[PDB]
Symmetry: C6
């Protein structure tokens, strides 16, 4: 569905998968985030939104339109403490979706810290995060290009059930996770 993304980050309850939720209603341009989130995860949300605001042009998001919307990012399991930077790209994917009405591919999950430059930084506890995705029955799990080496210590079986896609840019995260090509118009050529 739109605005809904499955992230993998640390939670009081160990640190499994997250059901990040966002809503883009008519407002003044205010940003709200809830779900028993720690400071680090909160700042990851603020960064994620700047990454979207600073790419609104190629994302189709109109600046005027934006200043007329209130954004609320909620991470259900409201009583569950959650923290860390790992939901970075998921937060960014959820916002893009919300402001563009573009659905989030099903059975897709993602983990990784996002920078302002759009870079996807490696996270910790990939093992736990993949096992959580496994048990959740997820299909496609996007991970930071820099955690590739961590896969090695992950049970082949688990690895067998996951369609792991290492990324390094949020541009890739968006293309894989979203349905409608998030960036620019499609040009078709022929040899």
């Amino acid at each position: 569905r739109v605005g809904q993304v499955t992230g993998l980050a640390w939670t009081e309850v160990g640190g499994d998968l997250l059901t990040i939720e966002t809503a883009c209603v008519p407002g003044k341009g205010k940003l709200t985030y809830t779900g028993s989130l720690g400071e680090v995860m909160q700042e990851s949300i603020q960064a994620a939104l700047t990454v979207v605001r600073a790419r609104a042009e190629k994302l189709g998001i109109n600046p005027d339109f934006y200043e007329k919307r209130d954004i609320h990012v909620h991470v259900p399991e409201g009583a569950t403490p959650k923290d860390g930077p790992a939901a970075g790209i998921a937060m960014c994917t959820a916002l893009v979706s919300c402001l563009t009405g573009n659905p989030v591919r099903a059975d897709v999950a993602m983990t990784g810290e996002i920078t302002l430059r759009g870079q996807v930084l490696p996270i910790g506890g990939l093992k736990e995060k993949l096992l959580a995705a496994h048990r959740g029955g997820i299909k496609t799990v996007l991970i930071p290009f820099e955690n590739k080496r961590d896969l090695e210590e992950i049970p082949d079986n688990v690895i067998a059930d996951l369609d792991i896609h290492p990324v390094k840019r949020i541009e890739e995260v968006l293309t894989l996770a979203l349905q409608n090509e998030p960036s620019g118009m499609q040009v078709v050529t022929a040899k």
Copy 2:
């Protein structure tokens, strides 16, 4: 008369029981206020509840830009009782709808459950005492999270008999079921 009210079942420092969720929606400028010795999780569930309504304003027959000149005060009575949790979520959501549409809530219904921005109802803990409270309170029908159905076998024989429980999964049900004209 610009204020909805719905009986909810949520956690209180004096055992999670029966509460009257109140919501006023008066001439303002888009200000959200919430009182009632509310814990943080409960405070946040009030924010989730309001967003759900704002995302379906037109869908529910409410001015899509109603929030521009409308102030909203969410209070949960007996202001001295320390209370918390996401279980009053759907109740807060219903109250908001009632306040904004002028559509009255059935006084003989009670509800408990965590609400999601997508409108789904999540399961809650301490289901026994919640219903036990609705029973002691004299509630005819109670809405509960579909996921809490397995929770009903641990519910006392007389209360499950005394009460008309209706497991729900979404907020659409809750609203048609709880509103007097919906």
Copy 3:
């Protein structure tokens, strides 16, 4: 401006007689409250204003009074800590009075927790509260309908001197407390 009401609420030195003052001066819609007020008493002031807000028209008050009015609620004995919800109905009576010019009766005191729906809720320490009103020469006291059971424990002489009215809703409170129409 500056409407006054004798409320009976909890102060650091137990239940006591309080003089609630409310200033409603020309402004921008800011609510200020002072007098060493605890968090719960602060929330009852907020609940009390949201109640006249939601009922401004029926009270003959301009529906957009808050848009250009500033409210200062001050409870004298500035150093004395106070808290609790028992002053709610009196805050609502003070606000109503300030905004409509209708003066508050003398020899009248009230105690009761206010809800957004306008229902008056039972408070505690009624004995200590009524003794205070008695020692202060109060003629008429307003208590919540559900505090009638607590009357049995009050000395007969105190009961005999005081003209006690158990009220259910805020409308009764204003009718009995305001010396004019409302």
Copy 4:
């Protein structure tokens, strides 16, 4: 001394005299309070300001100053902690003088809690306050009418050179402290 008043209010190093300062410069209506002020003393300033606002009309003050002027209340001895409500009437006097250009009389000091209704309430530690007025070279001292009984246990010599005026209302204070016709 326009906007400068000598108030007798508690401080960490004792209940001596304080020189209240006020600046009401053109701005957008923001009120600043400084001088290591306690919460209670800070609220006494808000109380006093409201009093002036409610009577701006009768006090020859543009009852629209609230949004056109910036007010800064400072109490020198910057690092010295100060608190309590005993400086309330001095704050009000200080403010009125600032908004009207009406200077305050020399050799005058005042102590007393202020209410929004303009009533002057009794204060504590009178013995130390008046002692600080003596050494301060103060001629006239205004005190809460209800601190009159305190004058008894006060040394003859201290009283001796003091023109103590126990007042009941803020009007008495303005007329007694200000130089020009209030």
Copy 5:
């Protein structure tokens, strides 16, 4: 665009030579202050501005400048805790110098607490402040007039090398500290 004054005040390292900076670029009138400042020192900044604002035109400063200007006061060595009211006269001197373009002399250092009326109040730790100005090779030092006796405790070799000016009011410091006569 940026005023700079060498003041003397208390730092985590003790009374030291401080460079008080002040930017006054275009804005809407927001006051910002940084440099690990304690509350007392922050309040002295607020007091120092109000003084300039209150003497705007006399100081040759376009009144209503605070309507189109932003002010940021920063005291370098951002990691070093700093506090006290002793840099007040210097804060006022950096502002005046910032808003008028009148340069401040580098061979001048000052210490003193500033009141709204413009009086300079005595400060503490005169010894370590003056010992610091000497080490830093400062030739002229402004100290509060009430601090003169204190000089008798500081060693004569240090004081003999310093051209010290005790000051009672802010005009004096602006006259002695500002390169070009204001």
Copy 6:
């Protein structure tokens, strides 16, 4: 490449090679900074911003960008704590680059406290700072002029490797770090 500057500052773990990021998208003048930054570092960002504002026209920047843009300064490693004023010049640089579009040299690292006057103050832990730049792969490192003495206590192996540029003012920092000419 623009809005990204390599800096050397204190960090809990130890990797002093920080990558300061800045976004200056269209907004209404909102200042925000994240990355687990301590207070001194947050303030250093504040002084850096004011430095830019002061030299706006000189840098060819619109003198009213502060009200037409939203500034977000992030320092990747969201979880890693960072503090100190040593990233001040990196902040100013990243900031100037963002508002002008002028790319930043990827081979230049910098450390140093910045002041409003634009001067670069010495910093601490220079050995660890440079060692970080060494391994990290930086070829040019800008440092405070006054830190020149600290080099002698750092192995030749590392410094012989670096193109150390001691600086006194922000101008030389900008001309040296920005790709083009400020």
